[PDB]
Structures are given as C-alpha cells and as structure tokens.
C-alpha cells in the first residue's frame, strides 16, 4: 500500500488542509442553470449546493422535473450512485418518485433528522408499521414492514407502492445514526461495517438501480461513503492495494457533483477507511 505510507507522510507533515485545498482548486466546475431557476428555489436546501445540469436526475414529470440529486457514474468500478440532499417537507414526494423511477433498491442515510438543534432532513419514512404514508402529489404509498435497530445503525424494510399502477417494491433503508455532530468518527470500523452491510444486502449490485445516498447536503458524509466504496472496489478489480489514487478518484466523482468531501478531516477519514477496509479485502 503506497497510500498507507503517503498517509503516514501527510499526517507527519500535518498538511491535510493543504492537499484538501489542492483538490478544491483542481475540482471541476460546470453549469447548474436548472437548479438556480426561481421556480426551483424552494426545492433546494442550501443555496450553494446545486446539481450540475449534465449529471442531474430528472423527475419524469413534464411540469417540473427538478430535484436536487446527481448521478455519479464510476466507469472503471461499474458502480453508480445517486447523491441527493435530505428531502425537504415539500420534496418528500419527489424523493420517493425518484427512488421509484430509477429502480433503486436501497437508500443510505448518513445523518440524523435533528443535528445541532436543527432539522437536517424531513421525516420522510414512516415510524410505525400501522401508520402508512401517502404522497398525494406523486401517487405513492410507503409502508414500514420491519425495523432492525442496532447500536450504530438501523436497517428498515419499506414497501413502496405505486398507487396509479398497483406495483410494489421493497426498499432497504440503511441509516447510519452515530456520525458525530462535529468532525468524523474516531475509528472507521463502524463505518466500514455499515458499508459492508449495505454491500451484502445487494443494493449496490448493478442489476438494481443506483443506490440513493444522502446526508444534509449530499456532499460531505455522502461523498465519504461513495469514495470509500469505490476505492475499495477498484482495489479488488486490480487486486493491488496501491494502483488506486484516492485523490484521483475524488476528482473524478466531483465531475458529477460539486463539493464531495467537505472538510479535510473528512478526507483524512476517507484514507483511513480505505486503508483499513483493505485489510478485509486482501484476504481476511
């Protein structure tokens, strides 16, 4: 592992903030005209986190097709992700319309509904089996089937029914619940174990639609997920834990959504998780 001694080299030199700035500067920049139309102002959670028009997800609704969401297509790894913001009270129906239209099998949530005294996300899934949710604007019903609460994540089977065709699908909600309010987790082990549960569920398999991933803005903790999954997969395809340049992967993902990886602590954590997750992918 080169990166393991490049990692040790960057900590010594304390220069995480420097590399992270390098990436901010090299990062690509494309139009996001649709996002900043005023008809869409209230469809965005942060005024400065916009999907690029080229990689954006379109709702199949000729009235307004906008939702703040990007398709990240990683060609060498054969892995696609949909990165999105946490739904607004007025976009919850859109969010499930998107999960329906894209044929996604799983949703990964990396935030709690309330963080730092504020609401980072609408409550967009049901809490009790018997209290189903109806989305009138998008003709969808959502039902909680089961719920498996563990120490640092919760998994939920949900049933999504299309009212106007009577088709149903089962969605897996993977909810990481212990991401620190400030900073990043002290060890990646929790995060890695959550990652592998998502993998084992099949939600990433390419017979399915792309997994929907989000946090508050869909770039910070969301990117850490995607970057770690993809780096670890490329280490497999090459079965060589050192042809993978984590900064080069990051810059390629940022062609598809701006700002992935928000802090330089997140970047360090990204390295830390890939290095550690490499143990259990090189035979173990």
Author numbering: 1 to 284
Pull text from the paper.
Here, a recently introduced serial sample-support chip system has been used to obtain the first SSX structure of a human phosphatase, specifically protein tyrosine phosphatase 1B (PTP1B) in the unliganded (apo) state. In this approach, a vacuum source in a humid chamber is used to load microcrystals onto a chip, which has a base that is compatible with standard goniometers at synchrotron beamlines. We use two different processing pipelines and obtain very similar results with both, demonstrating the robustness of processing data from the SSX chips used here. In previous apo room-temperature structures, the active site and allosteric sites adopted alternate conformations, including open and closed conformations of the active-site WPD loop and of a distal allosteric site. By contrast, in our SSX structure the active site is best fitted with a single conformation, but the distal allosteric site is best fitted with alternate conformations. This observation argues for additional nuance in interpreting the nature of allosteric coupling in this protein. Our data set allows us to draw comparisons to other existing structures with regard to the conformational ensemble of truly apo PTP1B. As may be expected, our model is broadly similar to the dozens of ligand-bound cryo structures and the smaller set of RT structures in different conditions. However, despite its moderate resolution relative to past single-crystal structures, our data set also indicates a degree of allosteric decoupling that adds nuance to the previously reported paradigm of allostery in this protein. No serial crystallography structures of PTP1B, nor indeed, to our knowledge, of any human phosphatase, are yet available.
